[PDB]
């Protein structure tokens, strides 16, 4: 049970995540949206990165914001699953399908980097489908993205989900490039989508971080030369030699006929 039925012209339905994310239908429009609930004391802080970039097809866009007494209700167009769940269910993606989806993922990251943001927490789970047919994806949100103060993308604090953590973060003596780190993560996603398992895995983190530091991963021979070439241009490169999010988009793999 909930205390209210409606926020503005939006009928509330059911919680998708605790008391934080609610389903909603616009009463005049009849369209189904998703409503994320923040405290008014810290909502414009949390949402600051969402107002840095121009709108992009593969980055969730805020539809409306309704300010209550105690809470701010931020509305988004709904999703239809996530990439992680999709890869698990499918086991692995065909190169044709993977190329379509990964191009959208890379485009989203390229938009963030070139607009002066680093994500820091990139995972498959963070990308969610826009349509029922699960052909279009978008970055779920930019809430926890770091806004660069000028050009410099140097980060001191270690961030990331262990599987997506780059070697530069682990054996860091202070600063590292946030953009290079986000690109590393893109490599892991691409591998995981195509192969159906993480490139680096182990029993416990310390052993996992050893494999990453040394670059202990294998690519199946079954993947196409171009697919393999793209993987290694991210995961088997030091930041200075490693592709940028934008450069990924020009890669010959996407241009294949399939």
């Amino acid at each position, epitope marked *: 049970s909930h205390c209210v039925s409606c926020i503005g012209k939006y*009928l509330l339905l059911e919680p998708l995540e605790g008391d934080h994310v609610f389903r909603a*239908v616009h009463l*005049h*429009s*009849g369209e189904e949206l998703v409503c994320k609930v923040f405290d008014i004391s810290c909502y414009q802080e949390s949402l600051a990165p969402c107002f840095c970039l121009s709108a992009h097809s593969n980055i969730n866009q805020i539809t409306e914001i309704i300010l209550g007494e105690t809470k701010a209700y931020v509305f988004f167009e709904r999703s239809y699953g996530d990439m992680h769940s999709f890869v698990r269910t499918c086991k692995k993606l065909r190169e044709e399908e993977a190329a379509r989806l990964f191009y959208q993922i890379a485009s989203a990251v390229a938009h963030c980097h070139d607009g002066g943001l680093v994500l820091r927490d990139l995972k498959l789970r963070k990308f969610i489908f826009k349509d029922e047919e699960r052909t279009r994806v978008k970055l779920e949100s930019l809430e926890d993205a770091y806004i660069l103060r000028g050009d410099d993308d140097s980060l001191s604090d270690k961030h990331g989900c262990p599987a997506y953590v780059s070697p530069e973060i682990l054996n860091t003596s202070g600063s590292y490039s946030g953009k290079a780190a986000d690109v590393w993560s893109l490599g892991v996603m691409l591998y995981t989508m195509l192969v159906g398992r993480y490139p680096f895995h182990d029993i416990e983190p310390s052993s996992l971080f050893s494999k990453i530091r040394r670059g202990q991963f294998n690519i199946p021979e079954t993947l196409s030369p171009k697919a393999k070439c793209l993987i290694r241009s991210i995961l088997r490169r030091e930041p200075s030699e490693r592709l940028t999010s934008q450069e990924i988009l020009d890669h010959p793999w996407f241009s294949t006929d399939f």
Partner: nanobody, 111 residues
Framework: QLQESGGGLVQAGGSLRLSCAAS????????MGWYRQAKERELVAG???????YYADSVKGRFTISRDNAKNTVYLQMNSLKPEDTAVYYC??????????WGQGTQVTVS
């Protein structure tokens, strides 16, 4: 003042049709839909005055909703009736100062 109809019993795989009308001073822009309890009250189907609809994930493709703005009434056609769908179906009409009218309840069983 919501007068409704259509309650019945049916074999697993059959079909029922529900209907509800309102003859009062309700808004032209008023949203209309059907909830069911059985368990708690969830919205199974809804429809805006511009005919754009919502369906619960469980009943997508199986159930259908439509409103006649002239008569000021809303219908809920349901097919391939599962055993789980057994519940009391309350019609609702919502406006937005703010109004929210319920129906008495139309029972429908599956076996």
């Amino acid at each position: 003042q919501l007068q409704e109809s259509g309650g019945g019993l049916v074999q697993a795989g059959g079909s029922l049709r529900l209907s509800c009308a309102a003859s009062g001073n309700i808004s032209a822009q008023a949203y209309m839909g059907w909830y069911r309890q059985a368990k708690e009250r969830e919205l199974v189907a809804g429809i805006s005055y511009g005919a754009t609809t919502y369906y619960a994930d469980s009943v997508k493709g199986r159930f259908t909703i439509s409103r006649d703005n002239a008569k000021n009434t809303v219908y809920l056609q349901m097919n391939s009736l599962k055993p789980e769908d057994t519940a009391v179906y309350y019609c609702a009409v919502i406006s937005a100062g703010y109004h929210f009218y319920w129906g008495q309840g139309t029972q429908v069983t599956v076996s």
